Every structure is written in C-alpha cells, then in structure tokens.
Amino acid sequence: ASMERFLSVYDEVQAFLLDQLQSKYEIDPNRARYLRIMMDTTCLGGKYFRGMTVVNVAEGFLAVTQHDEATKERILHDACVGGWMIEFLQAHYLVEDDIMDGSVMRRGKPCWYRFPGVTTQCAINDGIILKSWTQIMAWHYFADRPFLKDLLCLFQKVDYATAVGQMYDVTSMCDSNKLDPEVAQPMTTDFAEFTPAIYKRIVKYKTTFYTYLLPLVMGLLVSEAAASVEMNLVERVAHLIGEYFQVQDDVMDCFTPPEQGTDIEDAKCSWLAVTFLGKANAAQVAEFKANYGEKDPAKVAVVKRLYSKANLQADFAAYEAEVVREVESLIEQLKVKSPTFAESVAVVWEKTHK
C-alpha cells in the first residue's frame, strides 16, 4: 500500500508540474512532452529507498498518534511529496555527476546526457530543472504547513553538503597543496591523502546527508515529531549507516559484474585503495603506485589482483562487525525518546545491511 501510494503521488506531482508550465510559463506541448520523458527517465527506475524512508518514518508515527482520518491521509500525502523531493534531488545529482564524470551507463540504460536528442547542452539544464522542481513541490504542497521553513532550511543544508561532497570526491586523487585553478591538476604520487579520515570526510558529505539524514529528518518534520528525537543521535546514526552504504558501493564498483565500474581508472579515493594502503608492505605500495589511475586494462588487472591477494574481505568483515556494534548502540540510545523512530532506523539499517 505504501509503495502504491508513493507511486500514485508521482503521477499527481508530474501533472501539477507540467500543467503549471503550460498555464504560467507559456510552454508548448512538445516541450512539456520532452520534460515529461526527462522526469520519468531520471526519477523512476530505482528502488526508491530514500523517498520511501520518509513514508515509513511517517507511517511509524501514525500508528502511535491520535489523528482524524483526514489528518492521517494529509500526513501520508506530505510524506510522499517529501519523498519525491528527495528522489528528484537525487535525479539532479545523478544527471550532473554523470556529465561531470563522463559516465556511460546508469541503471542498465545510457546516462541522460547520452540520449541522442538530449546532449550535454540540454542535460546540464535538465539537471538544474530537476532541483528547481523540488522547490516548486515544497512551496505548492507545503504552502501553509508549520514545518515549511524547517524543511526548506534542512533541504538547503543537505543540498549544499552534497555539492561540497562532490568537490571532495572529484579532487580526492590530487595533492591538496597543489589545488590551483591556474594549473592543470596532476594525480597524487605519494597517495598520502588516501587515509581513513579523508575517505570518511568524502563519504560523509557526498552521500550520507541526502541518502540517510534527509529522509529520516523529513519523516520527522512531516510528522511534527522532531521533539521525539535527539538530533545529535539522528545525525550520528545517519553518517554511520551512510558510510557503510558507500563502502558496499565501493566494493561493488570493483568486483560486481557489469550486468549486475571505473574507480581504479579514475584514481578514486575508494575504501578498497584506502584499506589496501593501510596494510600493504613496501613492494605492494610501489606496485599500486605504478598501476593505479590508468585506463590501461593490463594495469587495472594488476590493481584488482593486489586487492584480491590483500584479503580485503577480512578488513570488510571487521569493519562490518564494528558498524553492526555502533548501529545497535545508537538504535538503543534512540529507543529512550522514541521506540517508533528507533524501529524506523532499525528498518533502514536492515535494508542497508542486506
């Protein structure tokens, strides 16, 4: 029912956005059709975990709070709209990051900019529109809601934290002291910045704010339940689950078959490179430096072989055990003020851990 309600609200949001373009922005039907296809191609197809977390958090509070049926329906509708603002925000990131990174495929389909009738000229602007649409949704659907100011303020900080994260991510293969707009950026030779703390900073800002913090805090906001939680705990658990999620994506980029990654070629500061450097002997480090960040398949094969013989699964299982420990602890600390919210965080963890 929740997924069914969530997908139904997409149809209503799309019709509202397209009809407003016609009545207020002088759009013609062909341009409305182009934007309709753009919206469907960039916003749909995923699993909707981010958007659905808003719905799941709100449903949790509905079960333990007294409301009229019309209030229950309004809260669910608000959780669905809020969920779609997050999915559209993600769509904005995916379109822009695919252009920035020169990506080829996204969810077994070509990246949006690669469609023949799209091109980078239109796709950069299509990504800008996707983010504008999140604000149009908020100002229209939440016009008279007491949580409107807090929701816009939170969405803004998360979006800015994400833009900051993308900057940390795309400059992670360069020496900080050499960053200069005037001079072409060489790849690092010492890899001195491939450390656990620097990797944690990249991940924290690039994904955790919008993938985990935003859905959980939006669920609280639409429920008028922000008092039922200690915000310092919500932030701590979101960054922690968020970090684990990225570590899984970094492992998959290298080892998950294409049908089911270019982090080595792009010389990314991945969990695999950081972990490898933290345990490798002098000769393994020299061989890593000689092969990393090269498009040559023979060199990518050497890096993968180094990762395979380094037994990084042991470090991953030890990292996983520590995260299980810390997540269980934070969930317990959340149970004090809100057993309902703690259960929502437990579900988020189960969906991440699986």
Added chain:
Amino acid sequence: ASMERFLSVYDEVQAFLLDQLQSKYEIDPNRARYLRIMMDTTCLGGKYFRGMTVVNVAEGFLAVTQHDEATKERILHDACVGGWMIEFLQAHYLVEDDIMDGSVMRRGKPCWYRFPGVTTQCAINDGIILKSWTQIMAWHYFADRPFLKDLLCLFQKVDYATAVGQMYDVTSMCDSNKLDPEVAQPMTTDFAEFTPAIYKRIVKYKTTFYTYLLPLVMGLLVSEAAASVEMNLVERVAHLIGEYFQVQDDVMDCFTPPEQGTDIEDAKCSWLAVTFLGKANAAQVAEFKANYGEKDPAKVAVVKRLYSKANLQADFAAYEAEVVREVESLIEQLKVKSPTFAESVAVVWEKTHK
C-alpha cells in the same frame, strides 16, 4: 558611497561563506582558497547593475521614510546582501551556460571551465555551489526578517523561470514537433518558429526575470515597500525593459568587434534573424536558409551581409521608439502609487537605453 558599500559587503559575505566551510563542512585551507578564487573569478568583474539596482531601490525608499540610523544601516546592508544573491545567481548561470554552449571567452577572460586547474568536471559543480551560496546568504543574513519567506519564494520562481528560458533558448533552432530525447535534433529548415512572439517568449524567460524583475522586487522587499506598487505594472515594465536589453545584446553579438559572437553559427533565434525574416523577399529568405547555422566563415559573412543590406537599423530605431513610448507610459502609471519607485525604474531605463 553605494558602490563602495556594495563592494564592502562582498568581502563580508565571502569571509562568512569561507569561514562556515571551515567550521561546519571540514574544509581544508587549499579547498577554501580554490573556492575563494572561484568566487572572485565568477562573481566579480562586471558592472553590478543587477546587484546595485537592489541598493538603488532601497536608497530611494530611505530618503522618503522615517527610520532610526541603525534601521537605515540594516536596510542598506540587507539591500547589499540581496544584491549579491543576484550577482551569485547570475555567476551560476554564466558558468553553466558557458559549459552548455561551449563558450571560449567571458569578459575578455577564458570561461571558468576553461581554466587549466578547473575543467568541466569541477566547473559544473562550482556553478551548483554559486547557486547554493545565494540560499546560505538568505538563511543567514535574513534569518529573522519578515520578508524572508517572500524573498525565498520570489528567488525560487525567478530561478525556475530562468532555467525554463535556457531550455527555450537552446532548443530555438529546432522544430518543436520534432523535439524528442530519443532522436538527434536537426536544425529547422523552414524557420517557421523564428517569429516575434516566439522570440519574445525566449527573452522573457531567459533574462528579464533575473536581470530586471528580481532586482526591482528585491529592492521593494528589503524596504518593506511591496504595497507602494502595483505588482502587475512592475512585471510589465521589467519584461519590456528586459526585452529591449536582449535586443541590444543580440545586435552587439553580430556587429560589436570581439575586443569591445556565435549566434549565426549556433543558428540562434536572435532579434536580427527574426526581424530579417519579417521583411525579406523570397530570394533573401532562400539565401538566409542556405547560409544560417553554419560554422563556415564564408557562410557567416553572407548572413552578416544580408543583415547589413536589409537595413535592420531602421527596424531597431522603430522598435526603440515604441519601447521608449511604452516605458514612459508604465513609469507614469507607477508614479500614482510611488514617485520614489517610479524614479528607480526611470534610472534603470536610463542605464539600459544608454
């Protein structure tokens, strides 16, 4: 004094943004330096007409309204911050549009993405940060202002109208009925969509909202003076002055020497192409179709020669006379409710017309 105060506030805004990155976003000093150079290169160098209009509108109201000195200083400071949000919004557009259009130069300097240490990978994200910074400024400086909700709501609509305008602009050389993300877009052969009404729609959305409406309405908002005006008149005069401004830029793109344009090669729906088609005979139209939208300098020379022999200066002088007439009329209609605001619009017109 006003320019001097405006430029002083840039230093304070830059220090606030960079210091917040350090204390809240874990930025290192090299990344802060990269963003400082990015901000200066993209936001400074222009004439600041957009930002300064906010200041000029507020100064106009200060002269006719009773306030304590501390209130006068706060209003001016608010007009300056609001002015810089517009300049940063423009910077965002210029960075993104230069990447989209493949532009080479911007204000006698290379476009931001073309700097050796920047690249498209960083520049798309730098443009996203420039827009995020406009929201950080608003939420920090206007946190407790009664105009905060209206200002954010207006800024959002203007930004979305601009994104819509960029879409109308980049798709203006294509047949509407052929727009399709699945099929590579051919240039128009009939030029049936190169009409005054279609050209007016492009211009209205791509520049007039952010160049003229936003500065004037922001000046009113920071002054708590939105009642002193008929908003339908403000919109009418902004779109009208805005249209005239773009017509001047379209003429300059073709005839102003590079030291002091690619609209012909990019097959843009410019005022020159629209006006030419509106008066040309059958053989002139055939010669236009045979040469427009081609990078070949011999073909660009034919188009320029057609424009020169078509006596478009006569049509420009007649368009100019009609705009002078309509602007004078709207200024008179504004004088009824606010002689102060009407004088601010008269100054905006004088700076545009010169």
